[PDB]
Amino acid sequence: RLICINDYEQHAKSVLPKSIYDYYRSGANDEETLADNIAAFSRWKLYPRMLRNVAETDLSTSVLGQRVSMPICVGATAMQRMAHVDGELATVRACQSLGTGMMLSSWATSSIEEVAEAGPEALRWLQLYIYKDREVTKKLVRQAEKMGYKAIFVTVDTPYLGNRLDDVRNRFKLPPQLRMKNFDSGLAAYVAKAIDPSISWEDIKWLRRLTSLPIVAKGILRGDDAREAVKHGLNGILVSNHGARQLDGVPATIDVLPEIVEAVEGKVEVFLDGGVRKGTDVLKALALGAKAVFVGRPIVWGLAFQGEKGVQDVLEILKEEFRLAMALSGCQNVKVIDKTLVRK
């Protein structure tokens, strides 16, 4: 049956209710950036070196000083219990098995404590939204700290929710038995009531003062903004267009990655998400300077197939495709993945 990430999506479309599949699949508006996040990877060509001795491939690396088994981590995707009854608990258990890290949504269908209890040994980070209620926001940060999460990924590209046309058509809502457990389109309305469209760099200053955990700015697409994040004492940039779900017609993340890596001058780690489906996508991102990549939708498709086992399968497929791509390119380890491997 399922031997690559595309097969898991096709499986998920066959088993999920349409409204849930569309919620997960959709991009904003005409979905131009959604297509481009994938197409852009294909424009970057690989220039492999031969005869480098690749018997001993080492995929291991580090994210914000913490060791991981591979530069492939789980990104925040809301409401995972819609895909499988065990939701985020299935995901964290898979991450612990694989030795990689999980970024937990602020809009998870499982709580910060529940997830730390299901994956105590797993590397775990919290994705944070700035709620208009700063007390709620602070409590999330404090819970993350108490529960052994290792970083905060603050999402900065969502002052309002993007317009995903299928969600509006299907009047998207959570199924009845589920809740966001830490507290038109139903989600757009929620965001407008709950999430602060006023946030500015002053609020980044507040958050930097609030916690000593590493903080990564998630959703940066300009070099100037990346340089402002470095100025504010943040510890990494996640180059992201929010899975093409926010402003449509922004570039692919793999296309803006080199500008952001250049802009930060090595002062903080730069990560990428958006369109990662294959081991060669991971290799291209690392050649262009990313430390690691995050995967969103592929994880949800793994849950839809088989909960924890299906998440483990998806991560193992990406791991083995990445191993093979490194080997065929002449790369023994991630430290030797260099800029001459790629050209557009």
Q: Which chain residues interact with ligand FMN by CB under 6 A?
A: 24, 37, 75-78, 105, 107, 127, 155, 218, 240, 242-243, 245, 273-276, 295-297
Q: Contact positions toward ligand GWY, by CB under 6 A?
A: 54, 57, 323-324, 327
**CB neighbourhood size of 110 (10 A):** 26
Our CB check for ligand GWY shows the closer of 194 and 328 to be: 328
Q: CA torsion, points 300, 270, 143, 88, in degrees to nearest 10?
A: 10
Q: How far is the CB of 139 from ligand GWY (least distance, A)?
A: 45
DSSP state at residue 338 = -
Q: What element of type H or E holds 344?
A: none
* Residue number with the smallest Cβ distance to ligand FMN: 296
DSSP state at residue 243 = G
Q: How far is the CB of 244 from ligand FMN (least distance, A)?
A: 7
Q: Is 63 annotated as a binding residue?
A: no
Q: Is 23 annotated as a binding residue?
A: yes
Q: Is 127 annotated as a binding residue?
A: yes
Q: Is 189 annotated as a binding residue?
A: no
Q: How far is the CB of 323 from ligand GWY (least distance, A)?
A: 4
**Cα distances (Å, whole numbers) of residue 122 to 85, 209, 210, 273, 334:** 20, 27, 24, 20, 22
Q: How far is the CB of 43 from ligand FMN (least distance, A)?
A: 17
Report residue 265 as tokens: 């001058």
Our CB check for ligand GWY shows the closer of 52 and 169 to be: 52
Query: How far, in Å, CA of 338 to CA of 287, rounded?
Result: 5
> Which residue is catalytic, options 11, 84, 232, 242?
242
Tell me which of ligand GWY, ligand FMN, none is bound by residue 297, counting a contact when its beta carbon lies within the kind-specific cut-off of 5 to 8 angstroms: ligand FMN
Query: How far, in Å, CA of 57 to CA of 66, rounded?
Result: 20
DSSP codes of every residue in 244-282: GTSSTTPPPHHHHHHHHHHHHTTSSEEEE-SS--SHHHH
Active-site residue flag, 84: no
Positions at the binding site for FMN = 76-78, 105, 127, 155, 218, 240, 273-277, 296-297
Positions at the binding site for glyoxylate = 23, 129, 164, 242, 245
